[PDB]
Amino acid sequence: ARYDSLLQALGNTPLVGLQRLSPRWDDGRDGPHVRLWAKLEDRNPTGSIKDRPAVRMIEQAEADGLLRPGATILEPTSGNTGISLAMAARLKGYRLICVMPENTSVERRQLLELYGAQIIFSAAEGGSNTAVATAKELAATNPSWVMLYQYGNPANTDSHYCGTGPELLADLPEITHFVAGLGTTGTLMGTGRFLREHVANVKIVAAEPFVPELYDPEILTARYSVGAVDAVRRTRELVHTEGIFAGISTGAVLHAALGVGAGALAAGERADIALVVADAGWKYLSTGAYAGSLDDAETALEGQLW
Amino acid sequence: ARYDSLLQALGNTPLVGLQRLSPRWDDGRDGPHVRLWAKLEDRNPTGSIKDRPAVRMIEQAEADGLLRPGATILEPTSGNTGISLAMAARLKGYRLICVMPENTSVERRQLLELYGAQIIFSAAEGGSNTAVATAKELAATNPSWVMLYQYGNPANTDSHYCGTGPELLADLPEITHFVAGLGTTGTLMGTGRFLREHVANVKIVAAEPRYGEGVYALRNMDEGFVPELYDPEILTARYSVGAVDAVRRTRELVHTEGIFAGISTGAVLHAALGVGAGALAAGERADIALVVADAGWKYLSTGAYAGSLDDAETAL
Numbered sequence: 001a002r003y004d005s006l007l008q009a010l011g012n013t014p015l016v017g018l019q020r021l022s023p024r025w026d027d028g029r030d031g032p033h034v035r036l037w038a039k040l041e042d043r044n045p046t047g048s049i050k051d052r053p054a055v056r057m058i059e060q061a062e063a064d065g066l067l068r069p070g071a072t073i074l075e076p077t078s079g080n081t082g083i084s085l086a087m088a089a090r091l092k093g094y095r096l097i098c099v100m101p102e103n104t105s106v107e108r109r110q111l112l113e114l115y116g117a118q119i120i121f122s123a124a125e126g127g128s129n130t131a132v133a134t135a136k137e138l139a140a141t142n143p144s145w146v147m148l149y150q151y152g153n154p155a156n157t158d159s160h161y162c163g164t165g166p167e168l169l170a171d172l173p174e175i176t177h178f179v180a181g182l183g184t185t186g187t188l189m190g191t192g193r194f195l196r197e198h199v200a201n202v203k204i205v206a207a208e209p210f211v212p213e214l215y216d217p218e219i220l221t222a223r224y225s226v227g228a229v230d231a232v233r234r235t236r237e238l239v240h241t242e243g244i245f246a247g248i249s250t251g252a253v254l255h256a257a258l259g260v261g262a263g264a265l266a267a268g269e270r271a272d273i274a275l276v277v278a279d280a281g282w283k284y285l286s287t288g289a290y291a292g293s294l295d296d297a298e299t300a301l302e303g304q305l306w
Numbered sequence: 307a308r309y310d311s312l313l314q315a316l317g318n319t320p321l322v323g324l325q326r327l328s329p330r331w332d333d334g335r336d337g338p339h340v341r342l343w344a345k346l347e348d349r350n351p352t353g354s355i356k357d358r359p360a361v362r363m364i365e366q367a368e369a370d371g372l373l374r375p376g377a378t379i380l381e382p383t384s385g386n387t388g389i390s391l392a393m394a395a396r397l398k399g400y401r402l403i404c405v406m407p408e409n410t411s412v413e414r415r416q417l418l419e420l421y422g423a424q425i426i427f428s429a430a431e432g433g434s435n436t437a438v439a440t441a442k443e444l445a446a447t448n449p450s451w452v453m454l455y456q457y458g459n460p461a462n463t464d465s466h467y468c469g470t471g472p473e474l475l476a477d478l479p480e481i482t483h484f485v486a487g488l489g490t491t492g493t494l495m496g497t498g499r500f501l502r503e504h505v506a507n508v509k510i511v512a513a514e515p516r517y518g519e520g521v522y523a524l525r526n527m528d529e530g531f532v533p534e535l536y537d538p539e540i541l542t543a544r545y546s547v548g549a550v551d552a553v554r555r556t557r558e559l560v561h562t563e564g565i566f567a568g569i570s571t572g573a574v575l576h577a578a579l580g581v582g583a584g585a586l587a588a589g590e591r592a593d594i595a596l597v598v599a600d601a602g603w604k605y606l607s608t609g610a611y612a613g614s615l616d617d618a619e620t621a622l
């Protein structure tokens with residue numbers, strides 16, 4: 001039971017109980033359990049959940065006759081999707097050009113450069129909006145370049161509808177809540193549609209810091225915006241208490257999941273809350289979030305622009 | 307794949323065929339196949355193979371009655387073993403103190419600290435030996451303080467005898483060669499013993515740094531030190547690999563197979579490719595399993611992964 005390619009060693013990620021951070025691991029006289037379960041999407045080829053949509057988008061574009069050998073793929077990305085696409089591009093014989101905001105971490109730049117991706121740096125003030133606009137123009141100018149367009153490509157949502165969701169349901173049939181970051185919206189749209197088909201009364205909860213064409217607000221039951229200090233606090237808590245060295249979006253997710261769990265606890269409801277760990281902490285070390293005390297980390301955040 | 311504890315989501319790592327890098331993936335008229343298979347030990351809780359010996363050493367100490375609630379583990383390490391023990395100790399309710407020389411890099415320190423290790427800095431001038439002597443002395447002060455000593459602890463070897471080896475035999479029954487780095491020697495000793503017991507004519511091959519180059523190799527072990535775990539009869543061959551070759555191999559691995567590996571993996575691959583070239587020249591069939599002990603992440607600051615391989619290959 002083995003692989004012929006790194007591309008097959010993707011998905012089927014572990015789901016791990018957070019016995020210490022869970023509001024109440026054990027059912028007892030105070031009330032039923034309120035458990036958190038972490039889906040470890042860092043156990044993927046390039047260490048993030050984006051391997052799932054990146055590979056599916058390329059393979060869907062290949063099946064649709066859109067890609068020839070030595071073709072250039074052009075993608076607007078804040079990093080993880082670019083890295084995933086860079087890895088798949090190396091394996092499959094394509095060139096990759098990423099359009100990224102200029103204020104992305106040094107680690108993301110390093111990984112992209114190592115895989116041989118080229119980078120266009122669009123204005124920080126314009127964010128993902130300007131990155132996308134810039135990629136669109138370049139793609140119009142260069143019709144042979146293939147823009148997969150993670151923000152609107154249904155193979156993104158499909159990768160979660162066919163992978164993340166089925167896996168979660170098999171590991172956690174008692175699931176009551178799924179919590180994840182809301183970026184491209186692929187994870188929540190695909191996983192959330194799958195869960196809603198299969199599980200009566202399941203709740204689909206977004207955490208977050210133009211509107212992607214993938215987004216359907218009807219799939220979400222709740223949406224929470226999380227500040228940088230709370231995301232950092234939670235990220236640190238996760239590695240200190242549960243030994244899971246996660247990226248900062250996972251702290252945002254954990255903040256949201258702990259808010260949901262506190263709500264279940266107060267209502268004496270049973271809850272089994274799955275949350276996405278989208279990547280590990282390696283690419284975020286240069287932020288200072290993991291060093292020293294929380295006091296130090298909060299101080300280190302002053303002046304940073306992500 | 308549901309686990310109540312992170313400690314259970316350890317081992318059973320993937321084995322990936324390297325079709326592009328292999329000397330000859332398909333059998334045929336030119337001769338039998340010579341295939342490389344990469345064992346991805348970065349798919350472990352802390353991203354390295356050391357999660358195996360670390361957890362097993364703690365569990366064996368527990369079983370032996372050496373570790374009770376509130377105990378402190380002591381280990382002279384600034385590396386992957388310290389990271390792994392920090393994670394595992396924290397999860398099982400123990401304190402960890404890592405003993406290391408005063409001049410240890412801040413990078414290594416930060417990875418240990420974020421997993422909750424405490425650190426005692428032994429005298430810079432004495433290097434590794436003084437760290438080990440200090441850890442021993444500290445452990446001897448207090449029945450609650452226990453040194454595991456990864457270079458001599460048979461639970462290090464046993465983690466591979468009971469995990470890595472069996473997993474390889476299960477995924478690659480046709481295995482002819484196993485290649486890994488030679489550090490504590492746990493990987494090669496335990497996996498090698500296991501495979502030798504089950505596979506006729508299996509070859510166990512070490513990769514290691516050249517003499518006088520352990521520093522560039524990113525390990526703090528002394529030159530003429532022989533781990534108590536080491537048994538030279540287990541090995542068929544040893545490849546001493548230079549720093550430039552290790553870095554080149556690390557890059558070829560990422561470029562041809564997409565695997566972002568740590569530096570020791572480059573040395574391992576160099577060795578495996580040598581073994582492979584020998585099997586090819588002798589028209590023998592080979593299925594060569596090699597260890598990816600960790601991923602590239604913690605080595606980004608070395609400059610070994612810079613876009614230009616010509617600059618990167620001298621970075622160590």
Ligand SMILES: O=C(Nc1cccc(C(=O)O)c1)Nc1cccc(-c2ccccc2)c1
Pocket residue numbers: 050076077078079080081082180181182183184207208209226227228231248249252253
């Ligand atoms: O949505 C993303 N990442 C994302 C979005 C779209 C594209 C990509 C990409 O890799 O190209 C990444 N991250 C995310 C999601 C949810 C919460 C947070 C977050 C919130 C507060 C502090 C830090 C991060 C960050």
Ligand SMILES: O=C(Nc1cccc(C(=O)O)c1)Nc1cccc(-c2ccccc2)c1
Pocket residue numbers: 356383384385386387388486487488489490513514515516522523524525547548549552569570573574
């Ligand atoms: O043995 C190790 N690392 C090691 C040993 C014992 C403990 C630890 C640890 O991080 O805890 C690491 N590395 C290794 C093994 C084999 C070859 C190489 C190598 C050789 C040439 C250039 C670069 C690395 C490096």
Ligand SMILES: *Cc1c(COP(=O)(O)O)cnc(C)c1O
Pocket residue numbers: 048049050080081181182183184185186187188247249250278279
């Ligand atoms: C992409 C990503 C998210 C959000 O997932 P989407 O499916 O794009 O909504 C969250 N965290 C990290 C680290 C990501 O890369």
Ligand SMILES: *Cc1c(COP(=O)(O)O)cnc(C)c1O
Pocket residue numbers: 354355356386387487488489490491492493494568570571599600
């Ligand atoms: C430990 C280690 C080795 C050597 O393995 P041993 O089992 O200690 O011989 C090689 N590379 C890395 C990255 C390691 O952590």
